[PDB]
Scaffold this active site. Structure first.
Site, PDB file in Angstrom:
ATOM      1  N   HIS A 283      49.196  -6.052  -7.099  1.00 45.05           N
ATOM      2  CA  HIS A 283      49.775  -5.036  -8.004  1.00 45.05           C
ATOM      3  C   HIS A 283      49.726  -5.485  -9.474  1.00 45.05           C
ATOM      4  CE1 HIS A 283      53.103  -2.766  -9.818  1.00 45.05           C
ATOM      5  NE2 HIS A 283      52.909  -1.835  -8.864  1.00 45.05           N
ATOM      6  N   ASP A 284      48.862  -4.843 -10.264  1.00 49.60           N
ATOM      7  CA  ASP A 284      48.841  -4.956 -11.753  1.00 49.60           C
ATOM      8  C   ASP A 284      48.688  -6.384 -12.281  1.00 49.60           C
ATOM      9  OD1 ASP A 284      49.304  -2.251 -11.502  1.00 49.60           O
ATOM     10  OD2 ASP A 284      51.173  -2.222 -12.677  1.00 49.60           O
TER      11      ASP A 284
ATOM     12  N   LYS B 157      46.004   2.751 -11.554  1.00 56.29           N
ATOM     13  CA  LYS B 157      47.484   2.767 -11.465  1.00 56.29           C
ATOM     14  C   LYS B 157      48.028   3.766 -12.495  1.00 56.29           C
ATOM     15  CE  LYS B 157      51.018   0.468  -9.648  1.00 56.29           C
ATOM     16  NZ  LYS B 157      52.122   0.375 -10.628  1.00 56.29           N
TER      17      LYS B 157
ATOM     18  N   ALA C 108      58.270  -7.575 -10.026  1.00 54.83           N
ATOM     19  CA  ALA C 108      58.932  -7.423  -8.708  1.00 54.83           C
ATOM     20  C   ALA C 108      59.924  -6.262  -8.700  1.00 54.83           C
ATOM     21  CB  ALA C 108      59.601  -8.720  -8.308  1.00 54.83           C
ATOM     22  N   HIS C 109      60.821  -6.193  -9.690  1.00 57.21           N
ATOM     23  CA  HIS C 109      61.881  -5.147  -9.671  1.00 57.21           C
ATOM     24  C   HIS C 109      61.372  -3.779 -10.138  1.00 57.21           C
ATOM     25  CE1 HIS C 109      62.532  -5.676 -14.059  1.00 57.21           C
ATOM     26  NE2 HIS C 109      63.372  -4.635 -14.018  1.00 57.21           N
TER      27      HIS C 109
ATOM     28  N   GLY D 230      57.303  -1.992 -10.401  1.00 55.01           N
ATOM     29  CA  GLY D 230      56.244  -1.409  -9.549  1.00 55.01           C
ATOM     30  C   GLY D 230      56.233  -1.950  -8.129  1.00 55.01           C
TER      31      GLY D 230
END
Ligand SMILES: [Cl-]
Ligand code: NA
Ligand code: NA
Ligand code: NA
Ligand code: NA
Ligand code: NA
Ligand code: NA
Ligand code: NA
Length: 213
Positions: free
Chosen positions: A39-40, A126, A156-157, A159
């Protein structure tokens, strides 16, 4: 740099297996059912961290271990990457929190060299916090018989959490690599894993994931 308006993210240690929250769910990941999501992991989002220190150095090493693991076993690999110079009308409300977003620049858009995609790996555009929003992630996974998602990357908190709860709601069991994600702080990191564990997914260490997949 200034991604998320953070010129720098102070170093912090990744959680150990003994520090993980207890998952409410019984789900356990299986090689034949799982897909990896990176992710990203774009230069834009990682500049703020000290790449020689925790959490980014060990988190990147752990995503590289998971990529090598999946590549040797035919486990599908998905990446999410935003495009630069987004039109504010397409970027939506996240622009009210995080600015106009990255530029179409080699200093921003590329997935970092240490985690570079290989041929046959999906790089999804995305658009929103959840990798599923405005994408074909769900259908790409379904037709490959994958109903489990292993989430890695940043933040973590934000996407990673939005993606996990959407996977769960789409009937995809959700796993998050506790030491293959990074965040603004250890407090944000712990908050994300605790909320996922009690509502929608299973946090596990990279070592635990490599052993069971
Ligand atoms: Cl959508
Ligand atoms: Na800097
Ligand atoms: Na299982
Ligand atoms: Na298969
Ligand atoms: Na840096
Ligand atoms: Na920097
Ligand atoms: Na869709
Ligand atoms: Na094994």
């Amino acid at each position: 740099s200034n991604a998320m308006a953070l010129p720098r993210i102070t170093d912090y240690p990744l959680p150990t297996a003994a520090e993980l929250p207890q998952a409410r769910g019984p789900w356990r990941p299986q090689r034949d059912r799982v897909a990896l999501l990176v992710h990203d992991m774009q230069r834009y989002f990682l500049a703020a961290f000290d790449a020689g220190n925790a959490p980014l150095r060990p988190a990147v090493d752990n995503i590289a271990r998971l990529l090598a693991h999946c590549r040797a076993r035919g486990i599908p690999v998905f990446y999410t990457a935003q495009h630069g110079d987004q039109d504010r009308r397409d970027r939506g409300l996240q622009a009210d929190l995080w600015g106009p977003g990255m530029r179409r620049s080699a200093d921003h858009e590329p997935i970092i060299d240490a985690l570079a995609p290989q041929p046959g790996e999906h790089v999804l555009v995305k658009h929103r916090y959840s990798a599923f929003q405005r994408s074909n992630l769900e259908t790409l996974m379904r037709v490959r018989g994958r109903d489990q998602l292993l989430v890695t990357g940043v933040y973590a908190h934000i996407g990673c959490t939005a993606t996990v709860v959407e996977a769960f709601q789409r009937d995809i069991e959700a796993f998050i690599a506790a030491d293959a994600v990074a965040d603004f702080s250890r407090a944000d990191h712990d908050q994300a894993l605790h909320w996922i564990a009690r509502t929608s997914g299973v946090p596990m260490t990279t070592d635990q994931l490599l052993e069971v997949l």
